[PDB]
Design a protein around this motif. Sequence first.
Motif, PDB file in Angstrom:
ATOM      1  N   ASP A  47       0.848  -1.184   0.000  1.00  0.00           N
ATOM      2  CA  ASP A  47       0.000   0.000   0.000  1.00  0.00           C
ATOM      3  C   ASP A  47       0.886   1.238   0.000  1.00  0.00           C
ATOM      4  O   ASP A  47       1.674   1.442   0.928  1.00  0.00           O
ATOM      5  CB  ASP A  47      -0.940   0.003   1.206  1.00  0.00           C
ATOM      6  N   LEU A  48       0.755   2.058  -1.039  1.00  0.00           N
ATOM      7  CA  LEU A  48       1.518   3.290  -1.174  1.00  0.00           C
ATOM      8  C   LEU A  48       0.552   4.454  -1.331  1.00  0.00           C
ATOM      9  O   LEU A  48      -0.352   4.407  -2.171  1.00  0.00           O
ATOM     10  CB  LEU A  48       2.474   3.231  -2.370  1.00  0.00           C
ATOM     11  N   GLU A  49       0.733   5.480  -0.508  1.00  0.00           N
ATOM     12  CA  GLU A  49      -0.097   6.669  -0.608  1.00  0.00           C
ATOM     13  C   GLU A  49       0.294   7.486  -1.831  1.00  0.00           C
ATOM     14  O   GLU A  49       1.474   7.612  -2.166  1.00  0.00           O
ATOM     15  CB  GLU A  49       0.042   7.512   0.657  1.00  0.00           C
ATOM     16  N   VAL A  50      -0.709   8.053  -2.498  1.00  0.00           N
ATOM     17  CA  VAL A  50      -0.475   8.895  -3.664  1.00  0.00           C
ATOM     18  C   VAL A  50      -0.185  10.310  -3.183  1.00  0.00           C
ATOM     19  O   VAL A  50      -1.098  11.130  -3.039  1.00  0.00           O
ATOM     20  CB  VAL A  50      -1.678   8.873  -4.626  1.00  0.00           C
ATOM     21  N   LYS A  51       1.086  10.601  -2.920  1.00  0.00           N
ATOM     22  CA  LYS A  51       1.455  11.885  -2.344  1.00  0.00           C
ATOM     23  C   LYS A  51       1.553  12.965  -3.416  1.00  0.00           C
ATOM     24  O   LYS A  51       2.036  12.732  -4.529  1.00  0.00           O
ATOM     25  CB  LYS A  51       2.788  11.777  -1.603  1.00  0.00           C
ATOM     26  N   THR A  84      -2.780  16.663  -4.722  1.00  0.00           N
ATOM     27  CA  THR A  84      -3.897  17.423  -4.195  1.00  0.00           C
ATOM     28  C   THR A  84      -4.611  18.145  -5.330  1.00  0.00           C
ATOM     29  O   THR A  84      -5.841  18.153  -5.394  1.00  0.00           O
ATOM     30  CB  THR A  84      -3.419  18.454  -3.159  1.00  0.00           C
TER      31      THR A  84
END
Length: 150
Positions: free
Chosen positions: A92-96, A99
């Motif tokens: 699981d990788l956050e989409v940084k 925004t």
Amino acid sequence: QTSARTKTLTAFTDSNSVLFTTDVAARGIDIPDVDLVIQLDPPTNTDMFMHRCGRTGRANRVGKAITFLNEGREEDFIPFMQVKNVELEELDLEVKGITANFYEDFRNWILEDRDRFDKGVKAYVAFIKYYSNHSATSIFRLQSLDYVGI
RNA sequence: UCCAAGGUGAACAGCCUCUAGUUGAUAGAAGAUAAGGGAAGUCGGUCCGUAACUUCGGGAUAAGGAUUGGCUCUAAGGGUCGGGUAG
């Protein structure tokens, strides 16, 4: 051209470097000190998959391989590799940083030069053709493909 | 014993004609159908309405009215020329 390929490969082999390469570099060649391997898409044939992520792990070195899935028929690729005795642990990788304006930024950068528009559309159509020539037809379906997403 | 046109027939056949041959043979005059009965007889009774298809080549490259651009690796893809600032 062959000379450009040789020069690029010898520059990369020679300090933190990222390489954007097709399946030419996947098999055989050994670049030392390679830590991370990313497959932006699973390969057209699964036999080469083991090669693409096989550039690392020499002498049990700490190297990671990552793959990306299209959310539609992702339930079929993992068991397919499992039957072939390959276990893929989900990450699981956050989409940084997304925004705002990433696709807007891409679009307004395309609007500057029509060559960029031509290259983008050509690449998209080439990927569609590449997906058309895919083994394991059930896993990779043209109908279930996210055309708008791609 | 040799030569051997065409069209219909749309089943050899038959029918008609083109080229080419005939008008020869004494002359004139004056099988079919049937009402009712039905063996009572005798030895013996191809063309009108549908639908799918369907021929030859050349093309290779996912299509062929649309906004055509179309996979990875792998011989060649017309020739040539051209790169900064300073002493």
